[PDB]
């Protein structure tokens, strides 16, 4: 077999069960989702309250299940506005035990400029591209268009 097949095995057995975002300054829920936004090869859409743009720090919880073991599960996210990448984020979970369900909590502090850009201009014009990796092995690339409501 080969690295490409190993990456497909991981993807086959992976799923995102639920996700939430909280305002880190209060611990209050801002948004909750239950779509598996890890699914590649299609474009997804997420509708999120515009208050998220005005938060200096957002705590994100991603709950996921993995059939396969991963030595170093990590994410790369890029935020594109009208085709231009305005921000890049790197997150690391680490070792994933086979046949496990896990909650990954990450603090996200977006660029201060994003807190003043009008939601009316951003809405429907932002794509978050996420690349799921096991160390340097690309498992999936997903794309989600954001709407700020």
Ligand X SMILES: CCc1ccc(CN(C)C(=O)CCc2nnc(CCc3c[nH]c4ccccc34)o2)cc1
Q: Which stretch binds Ni ion (CB under 5 A): 1-9, 61-69, 77-85, 116-124?
A: 1-9
Answer yes or no whether residue 26 interacts with Ni ion by CB under 5 A: no
Footprint on residues 20-39 left by ligand X (CB under 6 A): 21, 37
Q: How far is 149 from 65, CA to CA, in rounded Å?
A: 29
Element (H, E) at 103: strand 100-108
Among Ni ion, ligand X, none, the one that 107 touches (CB under a kind-dependent 5 to 8 A) is none
Nearer to Ni ion, 1 or 26 (CB): 1
Tell me whether residue 109 is exposed, middle or buried, using C-beta atoms within 10 angstroms of its C-beta: 0 to 12, 13 to 18, 19 or more.
Answer: exposed
Residue of 16, 45, 48, 44 whose CA lies nearest to 32:
48
Name the residues that contact ligand X, by CB under 6 A.
16, 19, 21, 37, 46, 48, 52, 62, 75, 79, 81, 86-87, 110-111, 114, 117, 122, 126, 128, 130, 144, 146
């Amino acid at each position: 077999s080969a690295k490409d097949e190993r990456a497909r095995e991981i993807l086959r057995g992976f799923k995102l069960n639920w996700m939430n975002l909280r305002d880190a300054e209060t611990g209050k829920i801002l948004w909750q989702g239950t779509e598996d936004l890890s699914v590649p090869g299609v474009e997804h859409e997420a509708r999120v309250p515009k208050k998220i743009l005005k938060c200096k720090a957002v705590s994100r919880e991603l709950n996921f299940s993995s059939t396969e073991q991963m030595e170093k599960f990590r994410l790369e996210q890029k935020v594109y506005f009208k085709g231009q990448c305005l921000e890049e984020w790197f997150f690391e979970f680490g070792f994933v035990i086979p046949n496990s369900t896990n909650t990954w909590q990450s603090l996200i502090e977006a660029a201060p400029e994003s807190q003043m850009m009008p939601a009316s201009v951003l809405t429907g014009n932002v794509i978050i591209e996420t690349k799921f990796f096991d160390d340097d092995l690309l498992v999936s690339t997903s794309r989600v268009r954001l709407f700020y409501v």
